[model samples]
Target chain A: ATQQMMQEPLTKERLISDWNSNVSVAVARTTAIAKSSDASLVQFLAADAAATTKSTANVLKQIEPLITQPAEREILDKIMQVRKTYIASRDKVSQLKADGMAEEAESTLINSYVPAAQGYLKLLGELLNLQRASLDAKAAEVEQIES
Target chain B: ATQQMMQEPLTKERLISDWNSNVSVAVARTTAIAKSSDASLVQFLAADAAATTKSTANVLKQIEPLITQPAEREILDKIMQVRKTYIASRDKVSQLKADGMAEEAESTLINSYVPAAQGYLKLLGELLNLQRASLDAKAAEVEQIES
Candidate 1:
């Protein structure tokens, strides 16, 4: 299944879905990190990240209907799972903090949330590259036809 | 004075100074925004930005001393100016917010801070490109010597 999936072409729908999911995960994880930290300056960053996330999501939604292939649901499924992990980890950190387990919360954040955050960032980069390659291919095809 | 100053070649010392100043402004402005916002989630963002800004400044400082005659001081100066605008606008917003001038704060944030932030982002991009070009040139020189 893994090999077959690797051979399959990226679809626009799945790419957009991954982008949206990545943004959601970034927004969640950044917010979580800010909440966990005690620094007074972190709030402005959280607000800015939220604003960007919202704006990006809105743009994707506007163009979403054009992407209906639904061929690469597997990637979308994986992205959704990662997003859930981020959300769950974020909630866990907050709960730990609330329970006065500051040390444990810090440990969990380092071991679990940090790894998931890195994974999500890597996945986002891959999705972005796929979108770029797809666009390049389309451009080349148009050039060939014109030639 | 402004035109004569513009004509002068930028110095490494000035570049490092400006970088430090920009980071300080970013830290202060982000903190102020977080304090002004009522949302709980925004705090997370503020913390993360603060951490990143500090780390970035530290890294630059380490490399900065070795960057004499870096030839990118001009671009760095532009970035510093944009950053200054962002900080000044942010401070203005905070004052307005404090005075219960919600509408004014919102307007200044949208019209002034927003554009300044975008300009800062663009200037950073230019600086990155310059750095990349410098690295590539150094690599090519090394390859030529090896050949």
Candidate 2:
């Protein structure tokens, strides 16, 4: 599954097409959300905020105060920074790719953003598990008392 | 803010525009990074795995192994699949919209992908916080010990 080989440089058309694909889903979701009775209008609103001028990094940075653990906050901050950096690098790479420098785009992606995304994704997995375990344990305790 | 409405079809072009807006900002920093110093270079290089693709779902799949927890993995994997399916469904929605079947796409997105993306994004937030906190503690401890 990890097999990778030399391939032709990516094209902007492909990028545009790929993006169109994602937009297709989001728009549909937005429409459906508008219809749902209990749909999280807050999430839609939050997504609007997420999609706002404020960078996810900025949002994450702003969110630091709400998190209780300094260590976790640091992790969250780093991950957000990583994601922000990934987005930045990706934009440059896309530009480079569009400028007919597919190699640079490819290089940037293979060397910079991809790994950052990977790191963030991995870190995220750990955080999620930790949370689930914590929550599960708490639930178990609650169940023990309730029973 | 939470008004509910009947499902309405969204256009492909419009959705693509939204994605362009959301995605462009999401990876802005990562894409902007070019050749830099050793520390910067290492980080950019490290992030390469994440940028394996611009799409959020593709990137998540690439980093699955590094996640390391069963439940979290399930969630992450589900999110990725949801994105993948959403991408596919989005295409259908776009076609439906073009053929005047806008409601179909809205139904699909609401029933599936929206919740998935929310779950993914939320999980991502949790995971990032964990890393930020852990790393920050380490950075602080190192500084205090005069290292």
Candidate 3:
């Protein structure tokens, strides 16, 4: 409850700053790569929807490597699995664009990529709680070891 | 003080959901890896005393591998060093959980990770500030080259 009160307002700010910092850095990196060549893959990867998908993946990837417990491992694997699907969603859109279906690509992102991300977020939330529980359990175990 | 108000609360729900999604995802990864067959070490890195030491080391490893700049490297190194010391001090509190040891951990955290994280936050703020510094430096360097 106290935490909720503290967290209430910045919900929108979190999404904005998250996009501003994360997406901006992502686009910058992709743009830097594209500047050296005229590859559509590079360009499209840096494009709006594709870049967002990749950034979300990057976010997931950072957390994918730290667990020491089986429970935590399961949660992270699910998160990574979701990430792959997210990437595929973006890739499908890219293919649609190649087929001269820009509108189709747009629709795919709206219908698929965005919703996939939302689902990912939901699942990811549950996964994190599990991670924290794992951490707390680890904390307890450590106390036992030393005791 | 104002900054505290501005900074979002790091709650289980928000930590798992709206904010720090990247951190959450990263934690998920870490948890999963710990459970994997590849792990020869202890199941979870214990979180109380020894865990504190490892936490700082892991943070160091995570950032050191990623950052390219020597200056930022130095700052991150210092941050880790402080965190290491803080963990050591908390570990020194031998009577933690049994006789209000958890409270000691809480107090140690306030005295340690809280401030240390704030320092990292300050460094990050400086890094963000340096985006402008990089621009200014390039302008001066360009003029110097022309001259």
Candidate 4:
């Protein structure tokens, strides 16, 4: 017997909500960061920046194979590279906070960590935007073809 | 006999103009940086970020002894510190660009250099705000005393 399980087709709504739901976690990460420059004091209980970047990255890995749109693929690739830099930069700030270097930790968080995080989140936004826009264009194309 | 030239009294207008004119140069510096991320290719000929920061910092040196407003002194102190970090961060970007590392240089410019420069410019704005606010209150106080 073949070892196999039935899988459902991923719909557009499913893809949007799946990524959007996880992406919201990263949104919360940047929002919390916006209010607090202190790395130690900022609460990250909902979703760690590290976890969201990694988890959403895993989500990207799963969805990428199904993506037929060219620009979507291009932007998704950029998100992968930026997330790596963001993780490394944030970890350094976290380490500083762990060691009780409060001032230095805050400085690193505001000056470098936050910028990279913003870059990563911006790319994530662009990907979502591209996907939504492409869906609209495709529906119009389908209407044209039917006529 | 002490060799001294006759000096005009430093009017409120004089202090305001002297610094505002110089501070506008820094404004131009940050505005140009905002347009282009490439540190090597951006037009900085109007006023170098380094030059405006340094020149305004010198203007601070000459005028600081005359500044009697308490909070103005406080914000001015911050400008000095932030400008130092900005200068260092921007210099690193310039060096990277000089060595023909185009991609690395642009990344450094956006990720680190620009943030510091923004912080520096923000402090400059606060200084201007405090001075303008203080002057208006002083004018009202003068009216009150005359009445």
Top candidate (TM-score): 1
lDDT of 2 by residue, B102-145 (tens): 45646655665355445545655544444345446655655666
Off by over 4 Å in 3: A1-44, A47-70, A98-100, B1-147
Q: What does the interface RMSD come to for each candidate?
A: 7.1, 12.5, 15.8, 17.1
All candidates: TM-score of chain A: 0.57, 0.51, 0.50, 0.65
Model 1, span B1-147: residue lDDT tens: 123232112343345446555655664555455345544334333434444554555555554554444456676667657766875786676667656676787788778877887787666666655665665666565566666
**lDDT on C-alpha atoms for all candidate structures:** 0.56, 0.44, 0.45, 0.57
Per-residue lDDT of model 4, residues A66-107, tens digit only: 666678778777877886786676666656655666577668
- Candidate order by DockQ, decreasing, is 1, 2, 3, 4
Per-residue error for B80 in candidate 1, Å, reads 11
**Each model's TM-score, in the order given?**
0.39, 0.32, 0.33, 0.38
Candidate 4 stretches greater than 4 Å from native: A1-54, A144-147, B1-147
**Candidate 3 chain A: minimum summed lDDT over ten consecutive residues — where?**
A1-10
- Model 4 RMSD, rounded to 1 decimal: 21.1
Model 4, B38-140: lDDT tens digits are 4322322212344444445545656777667678778777877876786676666556655656576567767877787677667766766666676666666
How much TM-score does chain B earn in each model? 0.58, 0.43, 0.37, 0.65
Question: DockQ of each model against the real complex?
Answer: 0.10, 0.07, 0.02, 0.01
User: How many clashes in each candidate?
Assistant: 8, 46, 18, 0
Q: Write the per-residue lDDT of candidate 1 for residues A1-147, one digit (tens) a residue.
A: 122232123345344544545454454445454344544434444455457556755754654454333432344446557867865675566567655666776677777877877776666666556566665676566566666
Error of 2 at A57 (Å): 6.5
